[PDB]
Amino acid sequence: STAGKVIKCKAAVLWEEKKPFSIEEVEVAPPKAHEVRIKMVATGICRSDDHVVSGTLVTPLPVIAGHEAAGIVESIGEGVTTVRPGDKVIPLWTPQCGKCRVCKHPEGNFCLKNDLSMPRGTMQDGTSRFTCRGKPIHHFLGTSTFSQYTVVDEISVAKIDAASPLEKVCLIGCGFSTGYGSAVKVAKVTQGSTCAVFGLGGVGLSVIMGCKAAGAARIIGVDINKDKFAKAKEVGATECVNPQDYKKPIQEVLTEMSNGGVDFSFEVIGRLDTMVTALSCCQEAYGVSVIVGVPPDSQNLSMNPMLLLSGRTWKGAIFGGFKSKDSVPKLVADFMAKKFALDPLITHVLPFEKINEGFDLLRSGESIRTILTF
Amino acid sequence: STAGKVIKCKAAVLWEEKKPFSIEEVEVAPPKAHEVRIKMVATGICRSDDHVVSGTLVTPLPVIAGHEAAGIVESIGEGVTTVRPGDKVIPLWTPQCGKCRVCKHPEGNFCLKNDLSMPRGTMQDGTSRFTCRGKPIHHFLGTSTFSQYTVVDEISVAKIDAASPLEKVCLIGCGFSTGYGSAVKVAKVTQGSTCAVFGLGGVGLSVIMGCKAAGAARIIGVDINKDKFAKAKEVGATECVNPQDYKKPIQEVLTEMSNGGVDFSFEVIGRLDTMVTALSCCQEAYGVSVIVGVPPDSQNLSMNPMLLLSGRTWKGAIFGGFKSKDSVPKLVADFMAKKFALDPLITHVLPFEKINEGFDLLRSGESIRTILTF
Ligand SMILES: NC(=O)c1ccc[n+]([C@@H]2O[C@H](COP(=O)([O-])OP(=O)([O-])OC[C@H]3O[C@@H](n4cnc5c(N)[nH+]cnc54)[C@H](O)[C@@H]3O)[C@@H](O)[C@H]2O)c1
Ligand SMILES: NC(=O)c1ccc[n+]([C@@H]2O[C@H](COP(=O)([O-])OP(=O)([O-])OC[C@H]3O[C@@H](n4cnc5c(N)[nH+]cnc54)[C@H](O)[C@@H]3O)[C@@H](O)[C@H]2O)c1
Ligand SMILES: OCc1c(F)c(F)c(F)c(F)c1F
Ligand SMILES: OCc1c(F)c(F)c(F)c(F)c1F
Ligand SMILES: [Zn+2]
Ligand SMILES: [Zn+2]
Ligand SMILES: [Zn+2]
Ligand SMILES: [Zn+2]
């Protein structure tokens, strides 16, 4: 067997920003204590993976990216108790150590063991399990799912239902859970409310799904790409608007359409200007705006704090506010019981070897989620 | 009798920015339909009144300022049903019309009839009840309490307990209710939590009172004036820190003191820089920061939205989040029932004729609240 041995396999290595991935052989070390080595089955292309390529997100290079995925445990290191070889699993790019002050807090989920705030591109122990051309290669968010095999810390993996369709439930590893939780858990959308969702990609569609599940009466989708509107309406948008169609700024348009401002707004793009526009369009006394989009590295927004003094609430969240290891298995169980749908998010399927075509589809505006199969 | 007649009385007129009040005779018209004329008994000096003088707040001049006050109804216009001549009352600088979407919302209090967002300096009907030297004089926030008599709209006055000591409960008209509500209602401070309060004036002390009432374990007061610390500890601060004493930025100091960030922070000054510092010092995953201080007119702050993406909540509020006409009588009843103290806020009691000396005490750092007695 492969247990305890280096695995040679193919991965998509990013050597340089603004370049295609290189599909080539890597060496994947065996798992150390409290680590898990996973044979990947499916991985989604999230815009955050593209942010690594574009330098919107800064993480050390060279790197194996990928964070939205599902696979099967190949082997476990010493002392692992929560998964076994042959288990279906979803890697957790937001870990859940269960021990830090955030993991112990009833409403926190941004575990202090994350590799997001101050990215090292390593395992928890500060080292890498990947070699390529004899060179160490960085991890990404402790997951590195753009590889036939990855190694993750135990706090960065959840066991899921053995009957799970991995080519669908990989989306619970990022885009679905993030958008759905941003609506239902972070914003706490109320029955009969009016919501505005800026950005109608996979995450924004999942926000719409959550707003509809919460009983919103109106869900206004906002996108500069009108090709996104049909699917947004299919999953619950009641109106869609394209800011490019209007002479006035879209915050003014949305305030007029909502007879004085929306109850809940969501920024699901990653632009400083739309973060401020989304805040402005929620009602000034009781509105809530949630930032979901990832902003460009190290850039600050400018805003008038009178927008908050009148009573608005502004918040953001990682991974929909979900405590990742507790929540992922429950979300898979709910998917299996048909409590929500994932197919509306999946527009394209490709083999892993066609990863660059999958990124081209995202960048052209044509796809929502492309799922890559190993 | 005065009812139905013009009253000539003394008031403090502000003819231009950055000049002393002029204490002189004005004419006060009788109340029209749905208006109430009040003989003032006591009014507090709030920093927001000083903001009118300093140009921090823009409102039409000339003006009779004052918004934190209590008095006795002299007469009512046709159609008034909520107060009668002889009633003790507190003017409401945030009205409660009861009809607008904000008044009908369970968590809104910034009634759309307010004169804050787009100040007109008038009664609801767009006219003034004040003349001085033959010139019309603007109202301020529908209240204009720096006058022996004022006229307010019915939606801008609350009837209070007939046995109320007006030289104390005038503080329920602004500073106490604002700070206390910002803690208990807006932030929803939890038992055992750690709070940081930036600014230890009358409003910040009231925030501390609310944090202590909510059962906070630690309440860290922050002020550049160490003379403010003794009273802050008297009303519940467990520690006080002066940013000037430190080589590091105070957000770093407060993060260290709180072993990774506070649960709740409050900006109770009115500076863009301390609004961002207060947000930063709350724990990145689950912290809450409330803006209470009034920012300088038309100035934007700069901030990194990653502070929110990790999970922080940022909000602001007017008047502690309290629906004004519902809440003010209950707060007075609570004071009468010894549920909270007001004396710790009152450092000076002066005749109304010494209004300018009262403002000088505030500006010098020497007072918390001066109460002016008519
Ligand atoms: N907070 C989290 O945990 C988290 C998780 C997953 C994704 N993200 C971020 O969320 C964002 C969306 O991800 P995704 O859905 O995969 O991306 P996506 O598929 O690229 O969708 C973004 C959408 O925004 C639209 N858009 C671009 N500019 C504008 C504009 N000015 N106004 C309106 N619409 C515009 C665009 O046409 C597209 O449909 C990205 O920034 C991700 O990095 C955050
Ligand atoms: N949101 C509302 O409804 C509302 C109500 C009442 C007051 N306010 C505002 O709240 C603020 C405080 O009012 P107040 O308590 O009457 O004022 P105040 O009595 O002038 O108190 C302000 C305190 O801030 C301190 N301070 C000044 N600069 C700094 C600094 N850099 N760091 C730390 N401390 C500093 C100062 O020494 C003083 O003790 C003002 O901006 C008011 O306009 C808002
Ligand atoms: O898509 C999820 C996602 C994020 F929300 C980030 F904030 C981030 F930095 C990142 F790398 C990521 F993958
Ligand atoms: O002190 C209360 C108070 C405020 F909170 C304001 F925002 C404002 F503009 C104002 F005039 C005022 F008096
Ligand atoms: Zn993602
Ligand atoms: Zn943790
Ligand atoms: Zn109203
Ligand atoms: Zn005030």
PDB file of C-alpha atoms and ligand atoms in Angstrom, chain A residues 97-100 103 111-112, ligand 6:
ATOM      1  CA  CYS A  97      -9.332  23.432  16.259  1.00  0.00           C
ATOM      2  CA  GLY A  98     -12.094  23.306  18.940  1.00  0.00           C
ATOM      3  CA  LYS A  99      -9.679  24.763  21.556  1.00  0.00           C
ATOM      4  CA  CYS A 100      -9.086  28.476  20.769  1.00  0.00           C
ATOM      5  CA  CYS A 103     -13.840  27.970  18.446  1.00  0.00           C
ATOM      6  CA  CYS A 111     -10.423  29.770  14.126  1.00  0.00           C
ATOM      7  CA  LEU A 112      -7.096  31.246  15.222  1.00  0.00           C
TER       8      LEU A 112
HETATM    9 ZN    ZN C   6      -9.837  27.265  16.841  1.00  0.00          ZN
END
